[model samples]
Target: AKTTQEKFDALKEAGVFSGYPGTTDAKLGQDMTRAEFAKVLVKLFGLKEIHGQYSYKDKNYDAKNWAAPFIEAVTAEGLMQAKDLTKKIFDFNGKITVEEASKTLVTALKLEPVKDAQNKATDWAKGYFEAAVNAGLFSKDANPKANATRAQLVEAAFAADEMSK
Candidate 1:
């Protein structure tokens, strides 16, 4: 079994776990926010300054939102979408669940399909979780509802790279 540091190192070397802007270390076990995940998602997919059909003029997250465009682009690309909408706008600042992050990674990597019992994840993320599990993105000990940690994110990205290889 590879240690957590091992997984982190491998992903860092592959350029998947590039620290968030202004930060250098992974800060393992730290909770991942939606905005943070969106930022990484944009980088992970190499999304340019691409705009999606959905434009947030101020409906949900406004100028205060740093990752507004990123979330929109990710949503437009159908990589990871809003699961909840407050006052008609998606919650871009919400905390991401491990299941959601796993699903997002699966989508980002376009991993092969796998047969899962489907009960371990939320309805929308069922297939995604299956793909993550099949790709070995997370171990059996992962909790879907728990907040995604930096270590978990790195593991997911590293596993995706391994799957592609």
Candidate 2:
């Protein structure tokens, strides 16, 4: 079977992860924003926009926001949140953290939580990262606490895609 990279390439070729303009591989080392991640999530899961549900209490970025459909799709699907639910604020332009990204991937892949091998993982990120690694969604050597570059995310996304088999 083709690996995660291959899966991602196939998806890209199928025009699934669109609207970014840049090639997925070229953006690997770059920091990904919340909005960017949401867009990817929308494409990855084939999430459809559900109208009229301004579920988020935060006025900063609501259902009407430019990326509202994407953001709402993720949250509605229980994929993950772009911001803290208690905070009620969504920083679409903010850089997404590693834990946040990992958690999303883990959830999306429906992986079971595993013990963390890397001791350096942030407390909040440990479970998700460990689960991702155990599920082969991420490399064992990956730094869970570090900023998850777009490349790393793509890698994880491919791994997650592979798990479906």
Candidate 3:
């Protein structure tokens, strides 16, 4: 709940994977269950009503199942897809790559990729992108081929902070 810019940096520095074929951590660790992930997501976004209506198998219920909350929360907020949401929730089970990280954040923030920000100066989003790039939060690497390190995420986010200013 209480995180520092450094921690965010660390998360970005952590490797991300998108099409990772390895059967490592596709879901949260055993100690960290789906329910907890869902709860945390809710808390992270401040979504209301932890216990709400939802369906499972053939039955409808008051609250989401172990993973349902997270899926539903993300979907309702437009974070995850209804279809893909159910597949995996495990985090840090293995190597994390950039493409996956890109999709994850892109979907989460609903960002669209316009020609690389470096190509031209544009609007608010592009400015943010350029600023991030100028500040070293973004890179020109084949975005999909490259990975989004945990430190990158943190550094980029921190650039938006007063300290960065």
Candidate 4:
């Protein structure tokens, strides 16, 4: 994925957890004076968001002194920002659950499972998991519903980078 939207959407859709054991609930809406919410997004997504798709609340949201340079870099590039990053979009910060991950991956990758699932979320999640595994992203230890960790993300990123184009 050359673009942040493409990569972010794919990573999220893979049912990767945006939140961890020590993070916030991961609501899409802004909280904690906006700064705190930004921190959470950084800690979770490595401050990764769709480039040119981010928005800042007001002129008040500063990219400097943010948790990580990657966070600020992504935000500065318009990949992740305050609510104003998007003109009409605000739903972010909401941790990417297995269900959302499924939809995100399937849609982003344009992948379709062999079977039609009655349990929509689980079905899509299964597809995303299988797809990622087949793509060599995980082993038997992978679980879609659980919040994704930095290690898992690094693996995924490496796989995504290493996998053939």
For candidate 3, the lDDT comes to: 0.39
lDDT (CA) per prediction: 0.69, 0.68, 0.39, 0.42
Give stretches of model 3 more than 4 Å off.
1-46, 52-68, 82-97, 103-112, 116-137, 146-165
Assess the local accuracy of residue 55 in candidate 2 as a C-alpha lDDT between 0 and 100: 61
RMSD of each: 3.7, 3.5, 10.0, 10.9
What are the runs in model 1 whose C-alpha is more than 4 Å off? 1-15, 18-25, 51-54, 57-65, 83-88, 116-119, 123-127
Q: Roughly what TM-score does model 1 have, to 2 decimal places?
A: 0.71
Q: What TM-score, over all chains together, does every model reach?
A: 0.71, 0.75, 0.37, 0.41
Tens-digit lDDT string for candidate 2 (68-123):
77777777787756367777666777787677787887777666565654545777
lDDT (Cα, tens digit) per residue for candidate 1, span 1-165: 687778777766766566657866668878877767776677667775344345543355654556777777776777766654443455565678877887778767867545554546777776767777767887656777788887787677666666666
The most accurate candidate by TM-score is 2
Instruction: Write the residue-wise lDDT of candidate 3 on 6-97 in tens digits.
Output: 44433334321111157433232223222333443344445553346353332332243344555466556654333323643333223333
lDDT, candidate 4, residue 102?
35
Q: Which structure is stronger by TM-score: 2 or 3?
A: 2
For candidate 4, write residues 1-165 as lDDT tens digits.
344334434545554324335854433222222233334334334445432222434332334323334444445644344444456333333334433333333333445543543343365366566665556554435556655544444444445434423
Candidate 3 lDDT for residue 155: 37
Which of the two candidates, 1 or 4, achieves a greater lDDT against the reference?
Answer: 1
